[PDB]
Design a protein around this ligand. Sequence first.
Ligand SMILES: CN(C)C(=O)Cn1cc(-c2ccc(-c3cncc4ccccc34)cc2)cn1
Lengths: 264, 329
Amino acid sequence: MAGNFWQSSHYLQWILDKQDLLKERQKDLKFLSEEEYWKLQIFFTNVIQALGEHLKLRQQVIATATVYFKRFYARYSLKSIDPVLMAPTCVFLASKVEEFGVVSNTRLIAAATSVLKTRFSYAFPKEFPYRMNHILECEFYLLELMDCCLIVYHPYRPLLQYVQDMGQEDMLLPLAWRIVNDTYRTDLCLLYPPFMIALACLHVACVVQQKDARQWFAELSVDMEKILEIIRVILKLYEQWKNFDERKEMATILSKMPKPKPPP
Amino acid sequence: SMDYDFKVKLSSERERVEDLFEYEGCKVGRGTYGHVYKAKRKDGKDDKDYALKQIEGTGISMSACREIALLRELKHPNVISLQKVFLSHADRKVWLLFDYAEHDLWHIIKFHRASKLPRGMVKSLLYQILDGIHYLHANWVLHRDLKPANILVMGEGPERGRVKIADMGVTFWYRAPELLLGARHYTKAIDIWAIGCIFAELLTSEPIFHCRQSNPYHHDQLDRIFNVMGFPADKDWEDIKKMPEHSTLMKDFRRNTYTNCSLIKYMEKHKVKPDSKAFHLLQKLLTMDPIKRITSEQAMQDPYFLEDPLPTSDVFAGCQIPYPKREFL
Ligand SMILES: CN(C)C(=O)Cn1cc(-c2ccc(-c3cncc4ccccc34)cc2)cn1
């Protein structure tokens, strides 16, 4: 699949208003601060990233799984479904959509158990508690509450088209691609079209590597106001990165997070 | 694991297929894809016929995933339209809802060859197949298995005569020769060969490469392609040497066996003039070399669709439909 973004379910249903997102978030903001909430989103982004790395999945599969996770918690509370169960479920569903196949029961559970044990022991003292019956249940809820919107468009594809158009695919692409992976620590994928995130990442990459791309950028006819809005978020994300000690803070932030209520 | 109040609210508000539609004993289709039912709304809001596709297996399979993912994005008059998705939590079965197409090419062809096809209808069917596949190909979507049973034709109603391309995910009569020779990947030309196979079947009422019933190499099917087409010369398909099953082809076959075999001779026996615009388009679709096969956009621009009669939006062209309604299995 590689269709027009303006006719996609991604644009027509999953490009949200920054204020609608904040209003839906207010349910969880009674337990966690605005700061603690974006730290928790970074944490699970990095959890999905470690899951995809372990399973040897391409960056597109990892990114599709990230967007699913972010999309679900944009409409629902962190207590509705445990994010520790949502993270491997998203990875499982995105692997099927992106044509990478069905991760087996034993391969998926072992990946979730190992990743949390060897890479997230600072936040999780107990072993991964869920089994395949939990993933398969969560999968049905995830598919239902996303209105069956499975095709996700990412900034990686237009970014490669932009760098190739510049004739700087060797110099700029490694850094710009890395900056794109980092946007998954923010809500940009829920607010702006992918090509726009790719242009802002390429702009930050040109600034870091000190390259005059002003001419190329001026011959685009894109809303540079919206590109500047994304740049500020990218710049802000690195300052957030500096002041956030994931390993020292996550145990307390996960304890503050609302948990699923059991039946009476 | 999951909030009680969240689960309870969703269960109370979830629309269940059995509450919305009556389909018990209404099965009209069966296959690898799953089962199809001719259903009616339980709430009398509509008297319209609907198609309910119950997918094969528990949970969401690769075929169910691929069909939901694509049909949710694809909007074309010649591609089947997904109206709703039902996730039956009780038995973990996936249901897909569409508008009911009364006919398909499998049944239309079956009716005609049983008698033993109007040429305006054949041209109209083909232009709508090429139109629908051109849209899919423009969105980098491949059918992978085009056959008459997938080319649905709408019956009486607001969309009379409209072709709908269905199914997104035993018989190799529509499989391109490069697949039969071990080509690992699916390509646009593989879909084009299939359309060429369908077009020959609509023009003659017989499957051009009919063959008697897990490796990619199917000797009997390739033999039938060469009895119709003739053995490909080096000049005709230069990369035949690059095929994984080329050594097997050289071991099992001899160019001499199909010396008096050509598409001209085959089509002539079924009363299709080799100098007609229909034949020349068919030969461009049925090209052995995939890189030498015409595209859907180039096929739609063919002077065949400019010749009398022009293709129509209603393939039947307002004439009474002779084909019977689908029987309940
Ligand atoms: C073993 N045999 C002999 C068979 O299955 C006989 N058969 C039945 C069919 C068939 C049944 C239903 C539809 C259909 C109709 N309307 C809308 C649809 C939407 C999505 C999928 C299918 C449809 C199309 C074909 C073909 N062949």
